[PDB]
Each structure stands twice: as C-alpha cells, then as structure tokens.
C-alpha cells in the first residue's frame, strides 16, 4: 500500500481550486498594530440570522445587530491557518504561458504551429484569431488583425467565436484537436514523404501521439488559479540575510498587485474599454513580463540588488537545486576534529577522545542509565550528565568499546574515505589515527580538517561493521592490488632490520629460534650480523587442508631472524621473506595475503608495524652535514661543460653555429653533464662511504641515512637527492624552455640570487599547476560519476557468448604489461591456451590458481577469449559472472554492487589529480621506438603481419601496403614485441632472419621522411598540379583539402625514370619504382634532376593526418572521457567485396569509390585528407581501414567494433596512467566503455521507433519479443554510434534524477511536456524522493518488495 514515485502533471483549475476552495481569503494573522484583519462566520452571537441584514429579535433597525456584533474590538474571523496543504489564490488568472516556450523548443509554438518570437509579440497583443465555427470558411487556426476582426464579426455575425485577449490563445490551446491533427498529419506525411518532411513532420506525428497517449490535457498548460505556497514551503534564501530590495520580484509585485487587483475587480465589475484596456495591458505585462521578456526598469541602474533575470533563481540557487536537495546537507553528530596518529592499538580502532565522547553519546547515556537503572527519570539522568559525574564515565566506556565511529576526510575521493573503527578514549582534544589508514584516506598531518560522524543503530553501525571496516576492506577496486603503505619508518626500520655487515661483532651464532631475546637484548650481538648459522623452520601448505613443517640451516642476519618471528605461518623463510628491507616487504606482504585473506594473515600482520617503528625508533636514523656527500668530480664536470659551452658561444661569435642549434646544443651539454654529476654523486653515495674495522680495506655497506632512504624507498628520490647534492636541473615557467644559465651550486653551498629567483619562479608555477589540478580532477569526477549512476547489476549469469579477445599490449622495446594480469579474474567463453591441446573448458571460471597455472605452464599462447562486462546478454543491469569477481572484500562478488561505476569513477580521480612532470609526458612525445629505430624484445623471427613484402634492387625490404605489422616471434610462438610498420620503412632483413634484444630492423627519421626509392634515375613529379594542388626553390605538395576540387582526385607521387625513357620495375614487385607522397610534404629536388638509388624526394614536416600533435594530460583525459569523435575522420570498409579507386571527381569530394561492386553499390566520395591505406587492385573484406589516422568513435563503433574500441580506450588510458605510475585493471575501464557504448542508435523499422534511435535494452526487448512472435522480420540491426556520451545523463529514462546535475529550468521545461513518470528506477531519484536505493544492501528488500509491482 506504499505510494510509487509521483505524478507529472499540469496546473488545473479543479486541483488548484481544491488547493484553495476559499478563493483568496485575508492576510491571515499579522498586523498587530492595525488591530483588525478582513472580518466577515457562524456563531452564537452573529446578529444576522434568517437573512444577510436582519436581527434575531426582528429589530435590526436603529442601533441594534447589523454590522455591530457582541464585541467591537479586534480579532477577525478569517484565518485559514498558516503548512498542512499548499494553498491557492487568484495570482494572475487570465494567462501564464511561462515555462512553455521558455525552453529553446516552443511547445505551445509547435502545438499552435506558431513561432516563438511571434508568440512573445502576440501575447499581451490583440490576438483575435478565429476559433472553429460551422458558418465560417476560415481555418481553425486562421489569425486575423483588429480591423479584420471587426469586419469578420460584423460580417459573419453569429457562429463566429473569438475572445478579447489571451482567450484567443486560451481558445486555440483549448480548440487544438490532437486526434484530428494526429491522423491528418499522419496520413498527409505518410502519403507525401520527403527528407525535409520527416524532420518537423514525422517526429511531429510521433510527438502528437505522445500528447494523445500522455493523458494530460493541453488546456491545463494555462492556469485559471495559481497555487501559492505557505512560507515554510515558499521559503526564499536572501543574499543579504533576507532582504527583498529593488528586485523585479518587487517591481512585478508593485505592478502586479495594483494591476492584478484592479484587473480582478475590473473583470468582475465589467469595466469599460479604458479600465479593461489599461488593466488588461498592465496585468498582461504583469503575468507575461514575469514569464518572459520585459524591461528591467527597476529602481535605479547599478548599486542595487537585481536577482531576477530569467526568474530561474527560484528553481536554481547556483548550479541548480543541489543546495536545497540532491546534494550534501549539514548532516548531524559531528566532532569536526583534527587528525593525530596513534601508532599503537589496532589497525581499526579510534583514539576517540573523552571530550568528543559523551557529547554525541548523550542519548546512549540516557538510555543506559534507564535500562541499567542508575537514574530515576530522564531529567535526573540529564542532571547526572550535566554534573559530569565520574560514574557516567564507566558506563560510557561500556557503550564506547563496541559502538563504532565512522571517519572521513572532507575532500573525499574514493569509497574507502569513510571507515568504521572501534573507539577507545585517549586524553586530549584530537583523534589518534592509524597511519597506515592515513595513507588510505590520503589525509596529511599539516592540519587539514576532519569530519567525524556517529552512525545510527543497526544498519549504520553493523553495516559499517560487516562492510566498511578497514581490515574488512583491503583490496582497492582501482589498481586491484591490496592498498597498504608501510612506508616511512617501516621501510627504513625494516631496511635497518634486514641487512648484513662484515666483521663487526658476534660473528656466527649457534642459537636459532630465540636468538633475538638473549642475543639482541643481552649484549655482544648487533641488530644485524652477516654469516649466521641459525636455522629457520619452514612450513609447506601444498598439502590439502594441512601444513607440512620443515627445518634447515640457512644463512640469515639477526634482524632477519627478528622479522621471521612476526608471521608464524608458512613463508619462504628469509629468502623472499627478508630480502633488503625494501618494497619487496610489501611484495611479501602481498604473497602472504595471497592465501586465506582473513585469518592470522590479517591479524598480527601489524607486528610488521610494531617492530618497524619499534626498532626503527631504536635505530634512530638522523640527517646531518656529514650525511650528505658532495662529489669532487663536480668541479671538473662544471668546468669542462663551461669550457665546451665557451667554445660553443665562441663559434656563435664567429658565425659558424646558428643560435637555435647553439642553444639546444648547450642544453644538451648541461643535461648530460648534470647526468654525470648525478652518477658520480651516486658513486660517492655507495662506494665512498666506508667503515673502519681491523684493516678497514674491505670497508662495508654504507649506513648513510640518505642511502637508506634512496635504496629502501621510505621517502625521497634520486632526483630530489640530485638536487640535494648534484645539479638541480633547469626550467622556465614563462618561456617554457631550458634556461642557458644553469645552477652550479648545491643546497649545502650558497645559492646565487638569480638561481633562487628562477627556482622560486618555477616553484611558483608548480604550486599553480598542482593547485589547478584539484578542481579539474573534481570536475572530471563530476562528469564520470554523473554518467556512472546507471548500473543496477541485478542478474548473475545470463550465459552470453560474446567476449573480448585478450592479447598483450606488447608496445615499444619492452612489453608494458603481461597478458596474465589482463586475463586474470575474468570469465572465459573458450580461452584455449597452448596450441589448442586442451587448456580450459567452456564452463570454467578463471581464478588465480587456474589462470596462474595456464599462465606459467604453456605460455606460448598469450591470446585468450575472455568474457567482459561490456558484452552481457542481460537486458537490465550487468552480469556479475560476465563482468568479473573482485571487490574490496574477497572474490565472488554479488549483485546490487556499483562495481566499475563508482569504482571506476573513483579510479579516474587519482590519475588526473596530479600531472606527470610538465604534462607533456602524458601527451605525444613525438619520439617512439618504431618511430626512430624499430627494436625487438626477445630473440626470434621478426615477421610482418598484414603486409605485402616488397624487395628492392638495393637489397633492402619495404612494405608495399600502408598499414603493416612488425612482430618478434620467439621459438615458442608467443608475441614478444609488435609494432605497426608504416609504409616507407627500409629494413635490412624483411623476413626469415632473427633478432636479438634491442635489435633495430629499420630506421626512419621522424623529422624528415626519407622516401627511399628503388631504381635510380631522374626524378619525375607524377600527378602534381601547379597553382592548385602543389605550390633554394623547392616544391610543396599539400593535402587535397587545400587543393582545387577539380584536380583533387589524383595524388602526387615521385616516379623515377631511366635515361632511355622506359620504366624499370622493382625486382619481385609488379609496380615500378615510385613513392607515394602524403599531404603537407615538401619536395626538395625539382623536375630535371638526376637521382641515384635510394634518393630522397619529399619529407613530411608535420603528420598532417590527425594533425595537431598531443592535446595534453587534461585535454586527452577530458577528451577520452568526453568520448566525442575525432576532428578529422579517414575512411572505413563496411562490407566485403572488390575494392578499387578509379574515375575522378569534378567540383565535388575527391576520390570517388570504384568499389561496392557486388551487393548493391553506392558512390562513396570524401575530402581525401589522409592517405588511402586500402589497395585499389585487391578486394577488401569487412572491417578493413581504408586510411590511416583516427577511426572516430562512430565509424570505429560501427566499423572497428566493440573489441577494437575497448583495445583503444584501455590501451590509451593504461599507457597514460602507466607513465603516471598508476596501473588500472581492464575491468573498470571496460565498465566505463560499457556505459559509453550503451544507448546506441537504432535503424529498425516495423517495431515502430521509426528512423529514430532508442536504447539498446529496448532493442533487446523489441527483437526478443519479435523473434518470439510469428513475425521475425520486424527486427533489424542497430548502429553502435555512442553520440557524445556526455548527454547520456540527459538520456536517462528517469525523470527526477539528472535534473539537479543539469539545468533545472531546461530539464523541467523539456521533460514536463513529455510527462514521463520517474517510476523511482533512477538511483539518485530514489535519493531525492527518500525511498532506499535498489542496490547494495537494499537490493534484497527492493527486489522482493519491488517484485510485487506485477500484482498491482
């Protein structure tokens, strides 16, 4: 019996009159000074019985009864209360016409077939348009002028129906016939169809069908009575603390008050043309001017508040209604503390203080004294608390121990920002917080504030107890690895713990297990000693459900023996479990967490921290003047570099060297010299530090704290240390180029004044950038999270056959990531590893053990078909089994989880939170492996995939096609390194040979294209038009975009000729010697110039195709998340068949398409920007790119496919954030792609939805019920174009939601006509309406409770 959503409807006189029923009655209560309101009710003393003006005694004459009652003082009889129901008063009865036509589309304009501006003019104007009639031949909508209305009324006489003002607008809105217009325009546009007809006609037909089947009458658009709110519901937020001032609300109050009151009394009084004209124009501007237009002639211009423009300040405070609802409120129960760090107690617990305690626990203290009975009444307990008795502290502790507290930092990013801890009292005003958790919050101790909230009872305390606990949530659904930061004194302390030293004291020790207590704590045994024979017991978990012990003597240092006592469970026992005390401690933490992720794996794992800060504090590392080491080679390197640069400026003084090459050269010498100072700095960081023992010649490992931080990894970096001792580097914020005045002074040495000047310059620029990235990252999270709201994730496994082929990235010299991490933890349709022997079966899940077994054994196959989230047969929501299994908790996730929605939306936050270096790193570096010299990873046979090998006469090898592939295959067959081989690359060995690590097959200069030819001879320009296409004198061949449309069909090419005139073809190739020149290229040698074998002709100064280099980190992040198609597309092949290019184009798009032969052809032209990759002498299949460059989102979605889209997006994102240092799994990114590819357009016909696109799920239901029905031909295909994906928030099927994320006025205007009910399917709409989110924990009650919707 619970209500469902709301009802979108219009303003009607019956419902609004129901909201009033009293018309407009009285001020109610106020005006105490006045002493009386309007005072017309029934009483024992009414003095007006049996009539209106008569007495009960029959003596109403003289001075008795009548208007005078029993009390002639104050207190009126009219009140009408204040809050229960929204009232209504007159408030501009005749017209409204405000929020229709307010949006860019005019709704009354399309229903009345009238333009916007003409509606704005004809309102408050004379109107006079005729309405229906049987005696008149004029149209129902036929509009007349004043005089035409006088002659029409005096001529036609009776049966002529028209009204004085807005009534003819009221009367057209009333007289519009939706059925006759629907069938009339339906049969008319269906009988006569045109390209211009479908627009504004067909959509008008379906739109009028939406009006007819909507149920709301257009007559309800206008309001006869306007419902007025009670102040509490009315309330307006004043800017000045609540002042009304001069605003157009007050202007329209002064004009609309007198004009509206005089208009009501005039209309009810049948006023003449003077008062009805002045009151009709003044009131018409009162109701109409507040709606639209008007002149802001308010008080004096300037020095006055004018918070009225579109009258949108009521619906939208700043960006919308967010401030009122759908955004963050002031919450409750908050300490608002500042973080302190407790090292002690438990990873999850709170050093909640006594002062913050008992302030928010007052209800639990009152109920505690009640149930326990130490108090008598609630007031007595209040006295006990206000008196601050000592007994209250004991029961207070009884409550606090197991009553958790949830914690969050105000700038919240990801899901782990809020975590539940078990509070314990600590004396102080602050909260001691676990430092390993501080890195999870990202919070710092610089004094950033803290929001402390108290959960409420069952769902909050226990939900945060079984979910949001910091130990219960370890894994981070962004990187995928468990996020723990045992850095700082844990890395330094474990580094000092695990290490060796020559000689020193103690030598070896026979004692083994308990050698730390007696040996360490007694005397004579250092914390670390090399060559100790102490044995270490081992445990083997390979047995089923049982551990197999073992023991043996291993050489290990005393500190390593101390670290071994931390984890009693099975370990590598000082091999991988000790190492150097580096991030490998986090690695062994991961391997220890790999088995039984609950359990003493979880608990007592903090002993690494207790011993870390314990024996780190015992170590007591320190930094001082002696700590840093200045290399003596610095003087020789700075002097030599200064001498070389002195020779450079001497050559520039002589004029032999240009200023540019001299500047960049000097930059190179100071850069390489700074590298030399860094390397010598490091050399003196390890081998210069010595320890004197006995002869001291052997010395020992360095104990320097700087080296412990650099090698250990607790903090600092080789670059920061390079600034501490070596050169600081060079940068210029205003110029953007490396300065020619380097900093030769170390921090220990006195810096120069100008050095400090440039350093604080660039440092200020760094502060500006790092301060700028926060807002941009926040806005990115705004867009992404606004898109991600749509994930229900309901069905478990729908058994879909579609899955992505999994192949490694294998880019550059070394592979960036292995395929095992991508294929790990993903459902697998087939996924046959090895040469198809057996491998996995069809119905088998991929775990870490099975995927690790197939990855380690028979690794020759790196490609396996794995199901992905983007491809799911589930109609509504996503399938957890198809998406994958992982979470902050253990594996095997369940339904109702946001998954990649919020996990990915929060995953993209840390990547864009900080740029990498100057942000040009994430951009196009313009220098790549295959771009300069193609290199191989593993020794093996290098082959060219999808290419035609063309041998030349010089012995080299060139690719005949445009887009090629160059891969290095090992003896097993697995792909090592594969890069796309572009046309024009001359390689020593095309195929059949081998290559080693770091082998370069071909070398091409990226600055100038060599365009190496084959047969020697004179250069001849082929298909080069002077003055139209193409324009020391050297020719310039530009792109066909700037070429004349007449000669743009042909393309310029360099054709070599012999001395006799005959053409000599290349050996083994049917085509002769020539080179295809792309756009923007420059040809140096002109006609009539002899050339030898392999002579250059033209070079590409710029790429031209997809020209523009790299947008940058922010532009590529907001562009990729923006999902919009590329600026300049290239070409694609939709269907298979004979592919050819022929004929020409005259005054149109160049390069008409000879192909499409076979199945019915269509002539395909184009501007011909990028070079054509496809060959004209061969038949092309479906899905082959006919040109290089970007494939665009639409052509890549309908051509390249979902798989190629996922490859592009995942590869680009993981490369950018990979160079940034953040490795993000494929799952969440493919969820972003899943939400990007939804709402694909639909071409289907016969299902209705004619010619217009609809949702993909609607196509699954329409085609499902289609093939289910006896007619299967009704279903058709659909285009995969993803639009811009930034309007997907506007494309949500829900009503109330996204209205706050978008413009409230525009959403209300556009959707309010469509009249679709929200239905509470939107999650954020549920957040606004108050009913629980049908996901997460509430998915059970929403599924079982919402499962009764079919019953009614």
């Amino acid at each position: 019996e619970e209500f469902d959503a709301i009802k979108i409807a219009l303003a009607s006189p019956d419902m609004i009159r129901s909201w009033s029923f009293g018309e407009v009655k009285k001020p109610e209560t106020i005006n105490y000074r006045t002493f009386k309101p309007e005072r017309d009710x029934x009483x024992x003393x009414x003095x007006x019985x049996x009539x209106x003006x008569x007495x009960x005694x029959x003596x109403x004459x003289x001075x008795x009864x009548x208007x005078x009652x029993x009390x002639x003082x104050x207190x009126x009889x009219x009140x009408x209360x204040x809050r229960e129901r929204m009232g209504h008063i007159e408030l501009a009865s005749p017209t409204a016409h405000i929020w229709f036509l307010k949006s860019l589309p005019s709704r009354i304009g399309l229903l009345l077939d009238m333009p916007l501006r003409d509606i704005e003019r004809v309102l408050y104007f004379e109107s006079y348009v005729v309405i229906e009639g049987g005696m008149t031949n004029l149209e129902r909508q036929q509009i007349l002028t004043e005089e035409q209305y006088l002659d029409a009324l005096e001529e036609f006489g009776d049966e002529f129906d028209a009204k004085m003002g807005a009534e003819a607008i009221q009367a057209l809105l009333k007289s519009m016939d939706l059925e006759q217009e629907c069938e009339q325009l339906r049969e008319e546009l269906n009988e006569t169809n045109s390209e211009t007809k479908r627009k504004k006609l067909t959509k008008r037909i379906k739109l009028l069908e939406a009006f007819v089947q909507s149920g709301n009458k257009p007559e309800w658009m206008i309001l006869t009575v306007l419902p007025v709110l009670p102040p509490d519901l009315r309330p307006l937020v004043p800017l000045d603390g609540g002042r009304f001032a001069t605003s157009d609300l007050n202007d329209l109050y002064r004009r609309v008050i007198n004009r509206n009151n005089r208009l009501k009394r005039l209309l009810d009084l049948a006023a003449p043309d003077i008062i009805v004209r002045n009151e009709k124009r003044m009131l018409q501007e009162a109701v109409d001017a507040l709606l639209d237009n008007g002149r802001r002639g308010r008080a004096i211009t300037g020095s006055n508040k004018r918070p009225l423009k579109s009258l949108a300040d009521m619906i939208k405070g700043k960006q919308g209604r967010f401030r009122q609802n759908l955004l963050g409120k002031r919450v409750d129960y908050s300490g608002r503390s500042v973080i302190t760090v407790g090292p002690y107690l438990r990873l999850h617990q709170c050093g909640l203080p006594k002062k913050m305690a008992l302030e928010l626990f007052k209800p639990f203290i009152y109920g505690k004294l009640e149930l326990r009975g130490l108090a008598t009444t609630i007031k007595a307990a209040k006295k006990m608390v206000e008196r601050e008795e000592a007994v209250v502290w004991d029961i207070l502790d009884e409550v606090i121990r197991e009553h958790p507290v949830l914690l969050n930092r105000a700038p919240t990013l990801h899901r782990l920002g809020i975590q539940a801890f078990e509070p314990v009292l600590i004396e102080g005003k602050a909260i001691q917080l676990h430092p390993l958790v501080c890195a999870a919050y990202n919070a710092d101790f610089d004094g950033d504030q803290m929001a402390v909230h108290v959960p409420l009872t069952l769902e909050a305390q226990l939900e945060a107890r079984a979910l949001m606990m910091s130990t219960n949530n370890i894994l981070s659904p962004a990187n995928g690895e468990p996020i723990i930061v045992p850095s700082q004194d844990v890395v330094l302390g474990l580094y000092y713990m695990t290490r060796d030293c020559v000689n020193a004291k103690g030598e070896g020790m026979v004692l083994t297990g308990p050698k730390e207590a007696e040996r360490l704590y007694r005397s004579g045994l250092a914390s670390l000693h090399a060559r100790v024979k102490v044995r270490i017991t081992e445990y083997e978990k390979d047995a089923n459900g049982e551990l197999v012990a073992k023991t043996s003597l291993k050489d290990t240092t005393v500190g390593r023996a101390i670290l071994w006592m931390i984890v009693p469970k099975g370990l590598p026992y000082s091999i991988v479990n000790q190492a150097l005390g580096k991030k490998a401690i986090s690695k062994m933490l991961n391997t220890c967490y790999r088995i039984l992720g609950l359990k003493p794996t979880v608990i007592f794992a903090d002993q690494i921290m207790y011993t870390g800060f314990a024996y780190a504090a015992r170590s007591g590392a320190s930094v001082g003047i002696d700590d840093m080491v200045i290399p003596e080679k610095k003087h020789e390197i700075i002097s030599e570099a200064e001498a070389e640069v002195a020779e450079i400026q001497e050559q520039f003084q002589s004029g032999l060297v240009t200023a540019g090459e001299r500047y960049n050269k000097v930059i190179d010498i100071w850069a390489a010299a700074n590298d030399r100072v860094s390397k010598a700095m490091m050399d003196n960081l390890q081998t210069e530090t010595v320890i004197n023992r006995d002869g001291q010649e052997e010395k020992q490992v360095s104990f320097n704290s700087i080296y412990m931080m650099a090698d250990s990894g607790a903090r600092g970096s080789a670059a920061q240390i390079r600034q501490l001792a070596g050169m600081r580097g060079l940068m210029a914020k205003p110029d953007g180029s490396i300065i020619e005045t380097p900093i030769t002074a170390n921090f220990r040495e006195g810096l120069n004044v100008l050095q400090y000047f440039i350093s604080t310059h660039g440092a200020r620029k760094g502060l500006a950038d790092t301060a700028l990235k926060t807002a941009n990252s926040g806005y990115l999270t705004r867009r992404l999270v606004d898109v991600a709201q749509d994930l229900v994730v309901t069905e478990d496994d729908c058994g879909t056959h579609e899955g992505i082929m999994m192949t490694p990235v294998i880019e550059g010299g070394d592979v960036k990531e292995p395929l095992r991490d991508r294929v790990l933890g993903r459902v697998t349709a087939e996924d046959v590893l090895k040469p198809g022997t057996a491998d996995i079966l069809v119905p088998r899940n991929t775990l870490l053990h099975e995927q690790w077994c197939d990855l380690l054994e028979e690794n020759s196959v790196d490609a396996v078909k794995v199901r992905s989230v983007v491809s799911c047969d589930t109609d509504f929501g996503v399938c957890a089994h198809c998406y994958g299994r992982d979470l902050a908790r253990g594996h095997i996730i369940n339904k109702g989880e946001a998954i990649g929605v919020i996990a990915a939306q929060s995953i993209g936050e840390p990547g864009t939170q900080l740029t990498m270096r100057t942000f040009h790193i994430g951009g196009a570096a313009s220098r790549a492996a295959a771009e300069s010299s193609i290199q191989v990873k593993n020794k093996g046979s290098i082959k060219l995939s999808n290419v035609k090998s063309v041998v030349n006469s010089s012995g080299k090898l060139v690719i005949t096609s445009r887009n090629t592939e160059l891969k290095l295959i090992d003896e097993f067959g697995r792909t090592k390194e594969s890069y796309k081989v572009p046309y024009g690359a001359v390689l020593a060995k095309g195929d059949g040979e081998q290559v080693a690590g770091g082998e370069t097959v071909a070398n091409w200069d990226p600055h100038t294209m060599p365009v190496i030819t084959e047969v020697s001879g004179f250069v001849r320009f082929t298909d080069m038009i002077d003055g139209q296409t193409i324009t020391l004198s050297s020719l310039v061949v530009l792109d066909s975009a700037e070429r004349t449309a007449g000669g743009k069909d042909l393309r310029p090419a360099l054709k070599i000729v012999d001395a006799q005139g005959n053409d000599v073809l290349i050996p083994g190739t049917d085509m002769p010697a020539q080179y295809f020149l792309p756009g923007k290229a420059i040809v140096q040698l002109e006609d009539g110039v002899q050339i030898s074998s392999g002579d250059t002709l033209a070079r590409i100064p710029q790429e031209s195709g997809g020209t523009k280099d790299i947008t940058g980190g922010l532009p590529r992040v907001a562009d990729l998340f923006e999902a919009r198609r590329p600026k300049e597309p290239a070409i694609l092949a939709e269907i298979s068949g004979i592919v050819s290019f022929g004929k020409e184009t005259k005054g149109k798009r160049r390069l008409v398409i000879t192909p499409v032969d076979g199945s019915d052809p269509y002539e395909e032209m184009i501007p011909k920007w990028r070079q054509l990759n496809v060959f004209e002498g061969e038949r092309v299949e479906r899905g082959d790119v006919i040109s290089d460059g970007p494939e665009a989102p639409h052509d890549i979605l309908r051509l390249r496919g979902v798989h190629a889209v996922t490859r592009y997006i995942v590869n680009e994102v993981q490369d950018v954030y990979r160079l940034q240092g953040v490795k993000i799994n494929d799952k969440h990114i493919e969820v972003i792609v899943r939400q990007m590819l939804r709402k694909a357009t639909i071409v289907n016909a016969g299902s209705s939805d004619f010619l217009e696109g609809e949702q993909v799920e609607y196509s699954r239901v329409k085609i499902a019920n289609r093939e289910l029905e006896a007619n299967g031909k009704v279903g058709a295909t659909y285009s995969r174009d993803l639009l811009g994906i930034t309007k997907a928030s506007l494309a949500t099927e829900s009503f109330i939601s996204a209205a706050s994320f978008q413009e409230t006025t525009r959403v209300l205007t556009e959707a309010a006509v469509a009249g679709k009910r929200d239905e509470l399917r939107g999650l954020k709409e549920n957040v606004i309406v108050g009913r629980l989110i049908p996901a997460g924990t509430g998915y059970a009650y929403h599924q079982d409770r919402m499962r009764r919707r079919a019953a009614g």
Partner: protein, 97 residues
Amino acid sequence: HARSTGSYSLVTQQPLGGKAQFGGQRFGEMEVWALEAYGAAYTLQEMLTVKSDDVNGRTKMYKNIVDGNHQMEPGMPESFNVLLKEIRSLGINIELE
C-alpha cells in the same frame, strides 16, 4: 566544534552550518558518491532525508532511542517539498496522485 542537534532554518529545514554550535558540518556530493561508492544505500538514503528534510526521521529516531527500536523512518523529504514547492510557484505545477 562538536555538535549534535541545534537550530535550523526556515529555508528547506537545513541548519545554517558551523560556528553556530549546531550541525554535522557537511558531507557534500563527494560524500554522496562516497556512499554510492561503498555501496551503502542506508547511510546515503537516510543521510539526505532523516537528518534535515525529514522531521519524522528525527522524531521517530529519538523515540526509538528509548528501548532502542533502532528503526529510522525513511520519510518524505521536506527539501524535496521545497523543490516541489518552487516548481508549484513555477507556471507548471506538479501534484502527486
């Protein structure tokens, strides 16, 4: 400054903010998406509603503190009634069925 319950405002029934010895500070849209991120429907749904936009949630909540019924009323948000309100002042007025 620690605060539990305090003065509210006549606008939307939300309290003013800090420095008033009232209010829970603020958990903004980032915390809304943090509860949507943790997947807790309870904390968010009763968050936006019970504390401010709902008097029923506070009255029934404090009444449930006695004997510890522990239930919190989901309620109909009065701030959502400020949105419905403002829309009612707008020329297109929406009414529930």
